Amino acid sequence: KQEEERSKVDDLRGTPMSVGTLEEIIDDNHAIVSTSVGSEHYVSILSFVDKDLLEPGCSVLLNHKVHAVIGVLMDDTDPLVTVMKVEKAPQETYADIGGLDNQIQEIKESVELPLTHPEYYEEMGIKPPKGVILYGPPGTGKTLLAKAVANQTSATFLRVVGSELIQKYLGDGPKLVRELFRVAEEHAPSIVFIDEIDAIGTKRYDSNSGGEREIQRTMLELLNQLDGFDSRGDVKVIMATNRIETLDPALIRPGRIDRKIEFPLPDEKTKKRIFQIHTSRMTLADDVTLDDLIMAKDDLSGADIKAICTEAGLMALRERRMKVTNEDFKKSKENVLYKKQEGTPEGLYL
C-alpha cells in the first residue's frame, strides 16, 4: 500500500534533520549542501520529493550525519510577509484635498496613469518610471500619500519598512530580499512601497555581525535584484526617505530610479486648511485666531500641526474643558517645539 512506501521514505529520513542554504544546480541529482556554516559533502536527494519546485540556491531539509537532501523547506512564515503582503486596501486616499496638490498630480500621472492605462507608451514610445524617491522634511505626507495610493488603486499594493530587512543571522536579509521580490513578482501588477531607507546607511547594531560587511551585502542583493535583470516590465516600486546624505549613488542613478520628488513644507494659504481640518473634529472657543500659529512656525510639518491641534485640546480637556483657550495653544505649541524661536530674527524686517 501507500503506507509502506511512506514509511520507507520516513525511514530514509533520520529524525535529527537539518536545514542548509544552497548555491547551484548539480543536474544529475547528487547535490552538495552548505549549512549556515557550510560543510559540504557530495550529498544525494531523497527522490520522491520534488527537486524542481525550486530555483537554484535555497533552503531544503537536510540530515546531520550524511548531510543528504531530504525534503522541500517549509514556506517559512517570517514576520515580513504578513506586513509585506498588504491584506486590505485600507483607507485615507483623500479625506481632505488641499494638503499638497502639486505632486498629487505628479504621483497620479506618474504612477496611476502609466500603470492603470499602459497604452500611452504605445503612441509615444516612452518608458515608465520604475522608481521614484518621494522625500522631504519629516512629517509631510510621504507615508500618508503612500497609503493614499495604496487605497486609491487597482494594483496589489505592497508596503515595506526599511528595518524589516535587518536580522542578525547570516544571509538572512538577502533571503528576505529574495522572498520580498517573490512577493513583488507573484501577485499582480503591483505597487511596492518601501520606507525608511535613510535609516539604513550610517547604522550599526549589537544584535549583528560585522557591520559594514552585513547590509552592504543585503543592499547589494537589493541592487542585484531590484533593477538588475529579471525583466522589469510593469512592477511599481516606490522608496521614501527624509534625508539623502546616507544614500549610495549607485542606486540614485538612472536605470534604477528615474524621478526625484521633494515635498515643500506648505504655505500659509494651505496651513489655514490643514490647521482647520486638524481642528475640524473638536469643540473650540472660536474667538481664538490660529493665524498666530499659522504665521509663527516658519518650517512647520504636518506632524507639528497634528500635535498642536490635538495637544491644545488635550491641555483644555486636561482640566475637562470642551473648548480651548489661546494660552492653552501657547502651552501646546511651546511643548511641541523645543524652544519656539522664530521671533527676532525676524521679527524686525518690519
Partner: peptide, 19 residues
Amino acid sequence: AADKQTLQSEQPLQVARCT
C-alpha cells in the same frame, strides 16, 4: 519511494567537502 532502495545504497558512498 521512487528511488528509495538506491538511496539505501548511497549511504556507503559519500565524500568531497567544498574547500
